[PDB]
Ligand binder design. Sequence first.
Ligand code: CL
Length: 207
Amino acid sequence: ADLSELLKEGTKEAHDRAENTQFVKDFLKGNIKKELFKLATTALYFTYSALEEEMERNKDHPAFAPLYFPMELHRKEALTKDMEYFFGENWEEQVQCPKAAQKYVERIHYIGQNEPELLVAHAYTRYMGDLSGGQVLKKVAQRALKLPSTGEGTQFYLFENVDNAQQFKQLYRARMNALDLNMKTKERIVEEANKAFEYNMQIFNEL
Ligand SMILES: [Cl-]
């Protein structure tokens, strides 16, 4: 009956599938050239901007409001700093939205403006996955791309405003499970979560 249990049990296949896409397998080594890492940083920028715009839009929506943690979870500012480091101050005038990302961005804007009960799916899959790895992936990328130990370029992977990940995860669980959702909506969230993973891998599968 619990949403977190439904998610956990009903997306293991897609979650394990995601955690060894071509790009990810290389990363846990570490591998990947700077130019692929910069592209992934570019793509992640646009998708997180989209998602965090919609999450703010539905800040006071009953189905989402308890999961709204801008200061603790949002990455647009971290990704912004990272883009600044690689591309420079006018990074926004240089890069463009890649086309696998724009498919996902279009999905997120639809969900955000028509079915905000399903934002939970995109937020759960993104931020809990990120909060999980962060501290480890950060060090692999620094070592692999010779980035400054001071943090420049890997701010995306750093959750400065979260004292303990596993304790915060439990809060997020309880807030998620305390959402006033019927069983039907919970199954649709699980389906939309699997789509979140689908969207994610096909982004990462593209130079
Ligand atoms: Cl770094």
